[PDB]
Amino acid sequence: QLNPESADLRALAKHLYDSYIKSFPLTKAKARAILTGKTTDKSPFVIYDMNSLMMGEDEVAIRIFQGCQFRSVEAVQEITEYAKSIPGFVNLDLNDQVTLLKYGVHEIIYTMLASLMNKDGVLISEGQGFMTREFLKSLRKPFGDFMEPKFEFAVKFNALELDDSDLAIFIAVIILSGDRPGLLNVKPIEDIQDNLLQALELQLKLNHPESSQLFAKLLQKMTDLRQIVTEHVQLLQVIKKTETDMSLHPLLQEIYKDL
Amino acid sequence: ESADLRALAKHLYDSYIKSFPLTKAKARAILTGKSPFVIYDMNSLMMGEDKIKFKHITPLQEQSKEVAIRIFQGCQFRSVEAVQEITEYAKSIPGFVNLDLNDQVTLLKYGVHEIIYTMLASLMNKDGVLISEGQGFMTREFLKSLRKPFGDFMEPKFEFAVKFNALELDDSDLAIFIAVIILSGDRPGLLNVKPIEDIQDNLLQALELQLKLNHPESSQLFAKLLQKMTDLRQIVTEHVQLLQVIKKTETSLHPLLQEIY
Numbered sequence: 458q459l460n461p462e463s464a465d466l467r468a469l470a471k472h473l474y475d476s477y478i479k480s481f482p483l484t485k486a487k488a489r490a491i492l493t494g495k496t497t498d499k500s501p502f503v504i505y506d507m508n509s510l511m512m513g514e515d516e517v518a519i520r521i522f523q524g525c526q527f528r529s530v531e532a533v534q535e536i537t538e539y540a541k542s543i544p545g546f547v548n549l550d551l552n553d554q555v556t557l558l559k560y561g562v563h564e565i566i567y568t569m570l571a572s573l574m575n576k577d578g579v580l581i582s583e584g585q586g587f588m589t590r591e592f593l594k595s596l597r598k599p600f601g602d603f604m605e606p607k608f609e610f611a612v613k614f615n616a617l618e619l620d621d622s623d624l625a626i627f628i629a630v631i632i633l634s635g636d637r638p639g640l641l642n643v644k645p646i647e648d649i650q651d652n653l654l655q656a657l658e659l660q661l662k663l664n665h666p667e668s669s670q671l672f673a674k675l676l677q678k679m680t681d682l683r684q685i686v687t688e689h690v691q692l693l694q695v696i697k698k699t700e701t702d703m704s705l706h707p708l709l710q711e712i713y714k715d716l
Numbered sequence: 717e718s719a720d721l722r723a724l725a726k727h728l729y730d731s732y733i734k735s736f737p738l739t740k741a742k743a744r745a746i747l748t749g750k751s752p753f754v755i756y757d758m759n760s761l762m763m764g765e766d767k768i769k770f771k772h773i774t775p776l777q778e779q780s781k782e783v784a785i786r787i788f789q790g791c792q793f794r795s796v797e798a799v800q801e802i803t804e805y806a807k808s809i810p811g812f813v814n815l816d817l818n819d820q821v822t823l824l825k826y827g828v829h830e831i832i833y834t835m836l837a838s839l840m841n842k843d844g845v846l847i848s849e850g851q852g853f854m855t856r857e858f859l860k861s862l863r864k865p866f867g868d869f870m871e872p873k874f875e876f877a878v879k880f881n882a883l884e885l886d887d888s889d890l891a892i893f894i895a896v897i898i899l900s901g902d903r904p905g906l907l908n909v910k911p912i913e914d915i916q917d918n919l920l921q922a923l924e925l926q927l928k929l930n931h932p933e934s935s936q937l938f939a940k941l942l943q944k945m946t947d948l949r950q951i952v953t954e955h956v957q958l959l960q961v962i963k964k965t966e967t968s969l970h971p972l973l974q975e976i977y
């Protein structure tokens with residue numbers, strides 16, 4: 458009914474969900490509660506235009522871009538924090554630790570960004586605001602392209618109906634890849650991941666008894682994340698050339714450096 | 717229904733061997749232990765052209781004569797040939813032929829490249845790829861050293877086989893994996909996705925079991941194989957990028973050839 462070996466895997470799933478909760482202020486649970494009128498105090502101010510943008514704080518394409526930027530640098534701090542709590546991560550070769558974060562951080566951001574989205578928009582400012590998908594797509598030419606592919610991923614991905622206990626493990630599976638470019642010692646990274654994969658596969662069947670092959674359907678979504686990161690940079694470098702007076706946080710530049 | 721899954725696996729494996737000439741097993745016996753003609757440079761290549769008799773990509777007179785361009789030309793003629801091999805195999809997968817015809821064309825349209833490099837990995841090793849029906853062996857260092865963008869074309873695939881082969885999968889596993897790849901419901905333009913996912917669902921179960929029984933020792937192999945699907949996509953997109961970049965070259969009269977390929 459539950460081997461002694463299974464228990465450890467549950468103990469791990471738990472330890473992880475816990476850190477996830479302590480490292481991320483806005484969980485999917487809260488995001489979903491805010492988004493589905495599950496309240497009168499949790500409901501966000503909606504921004505779908507210029508006047509709404511005005512009321513919001515009470516050109517546009519660029520203030521928003523900068524907002525996303527600092528929110529990311531923020532997230533990178535949250536993820537790193539989370540990373541330190543993954544059994545064995547800190548015990549790894551220091552360099553390898555940096556590589557993992559480098560290549561893992563944006564795939565993790567997109568996964569979690571989805572928790573804050575629905576097909577009409579996304580929560581912003583800790584869930585106090587909600588920016589619509591169409592208003593975002595109308596931003597000045599190049600900028601009107603930053604959010605769409607994310608929105609596109611989010612709809613396919615939210616379809617899996619995963620929750621924070623599921624995500625806490627999947628996020629750790631992402632960081633502990635091993636097929637990342639430039640790893641010195643792969644064997645150790647792979648042993649940790651082999652472990653994380655076990656815990657996620659169990660966590661998924663217990664938590665989604667009816668969902669057939671969710672474990673695999675989930676692991677496949679990983680190709681979608683890479684394509685998102687890949688595309689974002691191509692689009693990010695374009696912005697870098699048109700807008701010469703625009704900057705990209707040093708931390709964020711170190712991530713994208715020779716990715 | 718484990719007994720139903722092994723039936724699907726055996727069926728796919730049987731169909732797979734009937735559709736593909738050079739298999740992982742067959743190819744792995746070559747690299748290890750009548751060796752293939754080894755091509756490691758300009759002259760050794762010029763030599764193989766008439767020895768390997770892979771003079772199928774050769775008949776076309778005055779259409780390149782440029783070493784680097786001729787090698788690329790042969791990889792296409794061979795890939796077009798492979799696509800027929802893959803299409804036939806796809807038609808073995810239970811339920812495939814019953815999908816909307818438009819959807820069958822689409823699944824194949826977007827799965828071929830991915831499937832090609834997956835099987836190409838069965839033919840290569842750290843040092844080079846086995847070519848011409850296993851007749852020859854084209855070194856990896858010889859390829860990474862071709863002119864214009866050619867000397868960077870194959871290199872990425874070598875990086876991928878190295879990692880993919882690390883999984884030590886065999887034809888039994890590969891047959892099922894190929895089937896999964898084809899039945900991908902995220903292909904753009906699909907009219908009726910439900911049937912496709914239903915099929916890929918039974919395929920994944922079949923694949924999982926297959927790996928649990930075939931490689932008991934391999935922990936979470938199923939998971940690791942699905943993860944390689946992420947690099948395979950990057951490889952295909954990048955590859956496609958080259959094809960539009962390579963469009964900056966001169967590259968039986970072409971009209972018709974150009975049409976077939």
Ligand SMILES: COc1ccc2[nH]cc(CC(=O)O)c2c1
Binds near residue numbers: 525529567573579
């Ligand atoms: C305005 O929409 C955005 C834009 C960039 C972002 N980076 C990170 C997040 C939140 C999260 O990952 O939970 C985010 C939200």
Ligand SMILES: COc1ccc2[nH]cc(CC(=O)O)c2c1
Binds near residue numbers: 603
């Ligand atoms: C996570 O989604 C987004 C969407 C638009 C963005 N613009 C700038 C960033 C910061 C980064 O490149 O990480 C960003 C992030």
Ligand SMILES: COc1ccc2[nH]cc(CC(=O)O)c2c1
Binds near residue numbers: 791792832956959977
């Ligand atoms: C197996 O990789 C290759 C090599 C040469 C090629 N020429 C044309 C295509 C298909 C396409 O039109 O994208 C192609 C694929």
Ligand SMILES: COc1ccc2[nH]cc(CC(=O)O)c2c1
Binds near residue numbers: 846
């Ligand atoms: C494995 O990919 C390759 C690389 C170089 C090549 N040169 C000629 C061919 C066609 C053939 O095998 O007849 C070929 C295929």
Ligand SMILES: COc1ccc2[nH]cc(CC(=O)O)c2c1
Binds near residue numbers: 737839846849850
């Ligand atoms: C049997 O599977 C395949 C699929 C695509 C291919 N492209 C080039 C080759 C080498 C060759 O066999 O000449 C090849 C082999």
